Design a protein around this ligand. Sequence first.
Ligand SMILES: NC(=O)Nc1ccc2c(c1)=C(Cc1cc(-c3cccc(C(=O)NCCN4CCCCC4)c3)c[nH]1)C(=O)N=2
Length: 276
Amino acid sequence: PRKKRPEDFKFGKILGEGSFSTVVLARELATSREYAIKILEKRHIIKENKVPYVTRERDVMSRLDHPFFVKLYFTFQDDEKLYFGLSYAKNGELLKYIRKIGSFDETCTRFYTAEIVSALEYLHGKGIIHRDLKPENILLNEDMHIQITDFGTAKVLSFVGTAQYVSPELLTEKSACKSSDLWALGCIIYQLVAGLPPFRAGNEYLIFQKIIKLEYDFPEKFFPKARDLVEKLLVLDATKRLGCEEMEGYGPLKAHPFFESVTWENLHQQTPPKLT
Ligand SMILES: NC(=O)Nc1ccc2c(c1)=C(Cc1cc(-c3cccc(C(=O)NCCN4CCCCC4)c3)c[nH]1)C(=O)N=2
């Protein structure tokens, strides 16, 4: 199949903006298909020494083949810019829904947590670490299943993700591991239930302080089984987090009582609970 060009598309609104890319909604003229096209400027990438990150994004996404991940359909470039044609996840960032309805009830929390767990099991099965898992990086497609994105900063078995989801080892030994993503999962579950992430403060230095001290509390309402799970994930020692290899992997994690009524095998086939 011939390489696509910018002229093959009618570009529309901006879906996302970051430091090194802009995601634009585009309609392909030949098919009327909609893609989220991520556009990177070559000069800026080179000037900021990000070529390894752009290269890794492309390489990681081509290896992923699972419904809970944004897919890479095509790439091309012109003189100034790289273009990656990605899945258009019509309902946007999970963060928007958390802000919109405040907290998730237990059924919605359990369902979307289970999807994120299944996605991490697949990702870690590929020897890949995300390193920046967070609600902004978890999209919702038209059917309200998740699609995780943003892989330029992944590590395939230097970088620190968004402060409130950074794991202790990142701040202490400067190392990242699969377990680092499980710390982020713990933060996300907490945020889904509480409406806010567990470690928050007026600036990044203070957030970091609280993290290494494990300084946070549960709200009185917090679903008790969800609380038990979070306490097994937000563990300073990375080798003792439920789900990590030293704890015998995803079996014990998926067996946790919070997920008692989850059918793990066909989640993306299931109708998600309505979000209120
Ligand atoms: N860093 C990255 O790789 N970022 C990416 C990658 C791929 C990608 C990407 C970002 C996408 C972003 C995106 C953003 C949005 C979006 C942006 C702004 C508003 C909305 C929107 O109104 N959605 C309706 C659903 N609810 C309605 C109620 C309020 C919350 C949102 C969606 C839709 N899709 C996307 O669809 N595909």
